[PDB]
């Protein structure tokens, strides 16, 4: 997983569609972590 942003409102690197963002950039997917769903962790 790669830290590109945060899946939490208010955060500077806020991004809701983390999965799409990561997929767009060129990653396997996105899930914001399978527990610590605070950061936009790109599946990789």
What residues have CB less than 8 Å from 13, skipping those under 6 apart? Answer: 4, 5, 6, 40
Question: Is 43 exposed, middle or buried, given 0-12, 13-18 or 19+ CB atoms closer than 10 A?
Answer: middle
Report the C-alpha gap between 32 and 27 in whole angstroms. 13
The CA-CA-CA angle for residues 24, 25, 27, to 5°, reads 90
For the chain, domains (ranges, CATH) are: 1-44 (3.30.30.10)
Q: What six digits make up the tokens of 12? A: 């500077």
Method: NMR
Report the C-alpha gap between 13 and 8 in whole angstroms. 9
Report the C-alpha gap between 21 and 18 in whole angstroms. 5
Backbone φ and ψ of 27, nearest 5°:
-115, 165
């Amino acid at each position: 997983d790669k830290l590109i942003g945060s899946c939490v409102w208010g955060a500077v690197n806020y991004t809701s569609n983390c999965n799409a963002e990561c997929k767009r950039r060129g990653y396997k997917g996105g899930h914001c972590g399978s527990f610590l769903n605070v950061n936009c962790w790109c599946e990789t």
